[PDB]
Design a protein around this ligand. Structure first.
Ligand SMILES: [Ca+2]
Ligand SMILES: [Ca+2]
Ligand SMILES: [Ca+2]
Ligand SMILES: [Ca+2]
Ligand SMILES: [Ca+2]
Ligand SMILES: [Ca+2]
Ligand SMILES: [Ca+2]
Ligand SMILES: [Ca+2]
Lengths: 114, 114, 114, 114
């Protein structure tokens, strides 16, 4: 099934943050309405927050997270969770190898902000 | 119901990161095995990371997050999500006022690391 | 924080199912647009389905689950999870006692339907 | 990534419930310790509960959900969510066609019981 794609409320600012846990250099692309809006990269086996940024969901509210290592797309897992019908978390995990820990690149999207 | 309490596998490394979205300075205490193991303090209304660290779950694996603003405990909401039966997210949202956006202090705990 | 309240897309069909795990008779009230749309009542300590039905979120899409035992409101825990950005689960757990297993009345709301 | 596989605490009773929302007959298999422990088959576009039973996780605690339509395996999506660090939901969605709603056969596993 498709993973890493989330529908946020339109024209809403959200935070996107990436974590690295791999010996390979991670590259995270965040697309809004099918267009890259932010890219983060880094190499850490100690959960370094390789990047964070505030984006606007735009008119479509469509957000997609892509993870690649040296140009090679990683296998993704994701889900969205809503707490007290207000706080939203869109989560993504990724595997760039076969040890299957799926934390090589971890991305958390949260909203609302402010 | 109790919130902000998670049972992680014992003696395991996990990451804890806090984001702030409030006019008030957020104080995030992380207790492991019933003893404070880390504390983050910061202020932001733009989802800035006010702290991130790697900790160990201790002998019981019990990890608790508490949030307060100038001594006043914030109401918490939380949940744990597991993807592909191995990637874990312990999530916490908190409210320091009455607008109930529960993002004043957002905390993400993730494991495994490395 | 408020629990058991979910905002579904307006005028959408959804399923609601209640399970019981308590010595006490569980009374589950499902409100739509702040009005009772269905009530399930039964007793079971073996996860028996005390009710399942197809409802409509109505104009507002506001859905709320209330659980009471002998008239006394049970404490609730809840969250919404969305898989592959299409499959939604509105989950509710309730506690009518002190053992805090929060399964005394378990309610699962799912959409979209077929 | 692998989906529909869950690790529950060993020798623990859990509930497994399947809903149907497809034009095709859904075949849901629940394997405990790599052995078929329950099977539900049915057709419904209105969330009929085609099956709900209480099973024991066995010595391994490994539980797997498989869904097929007339011998053809459906693609699965899944996740586990834990509320108040006590109530567990193992969620599964399945897709038999081309409308990516993954609600053709929906399975919910919950524990603890009683
Ligand atoms: Ca890996
Ligand atoms: Ca890794
Ligand atoms: Ca607030
Ligand atoms: Ca706020
Ligand atoms: Ca109870
Ligand atoms: Ca109970
Ligand atoms: Ca379908
Ligand atoms: Ca369907």
């Amino acid at each position: 099934a498709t993973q890493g794609v989330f529908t946020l409320p339109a024209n809403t600012r959200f935070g996107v943050t990436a974590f690295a846990n791999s010996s390979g250099t991670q590259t995270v692309n965040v697309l809004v309405n099918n267009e890259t809006a932010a890219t983060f990269s880094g190499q850490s086996t100690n959960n370094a927050v390789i990047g964070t940024q505030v984006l606007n969901s735009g008119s479509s509210g469509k957000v997609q997270v892509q993870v690649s290592v040296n140009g090679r797309p990683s296998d993704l897992v994701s889900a969205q969770v809503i707490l007290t019908n207000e706080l939203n978390f869109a989560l993504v995990g990724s595997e760039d190898g076969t040890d299957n820990d799926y934390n090589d690149a971890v991305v958390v999207i949260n909203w609302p902000l402010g």
